Write a protein that binds this ligand. Structure first.
Ligand SMILES: COc1nc(N(C)C)ncc1-n1nc2c(c1C(C)C)[C@H](c1ccc(C#N)cc1)N(c1cc(Cl)c[nH]c1=O)C2=O
Ligand SMILES: [Cl-]
Length: 86
């Protein structure tokens, strides 16, 4: 409904950040993605809107070495491709 099912590569990352199950809201997905970024401290301390995720699961998932949380077409492309609806 507003429930989505992450595809495997995304789901792995979600469970890594603590998520249980295979069905989520977009908010839930965002929460756990963000939690993942925060607990793995993938961001640059000196430029905190910049996520450096090369050589990480998330890097592979996004197909990027780095990205700006301010400019998340990388993120939304991944979600378009990794969230299965209805
Ligand atoms: C490294 O980033 C940060 N660093 C800090 N420090 C003080 C160090 N504080 C906040 C953030 N931060 N900014 C934003 C977000 C965060 C946390 C939750 C990672 C979330 C977000 C962004 C990207 C993904 C992915 N993959 C998942 C959630 N987010 C969002 C971005 C969009 Cl486009 C939609 N919804 C959001 O919640 C932001 O803008
Ligand atoms: Cl939690």
């Amino acid at each position: 409904i507003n429930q989505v099912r992450p595809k495997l590569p995304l789901l792995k990352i979600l469970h890594a950040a603590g998520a249980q199950g295979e069905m989520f809201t977009v908010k839930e997905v965002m929460h756990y993605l963000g939690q993942y970024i925060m607990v793995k401290q993938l961001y640059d301390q000196q430029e905190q809107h910049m996520v450096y995720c090369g050589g990480d699961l998330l890097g592979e998932l996004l197909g990027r070495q780095s990205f700006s949380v301010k400019d998340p077409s990388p993120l939304y492309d991944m979600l378009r491709k990794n969230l299965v609806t209805l």
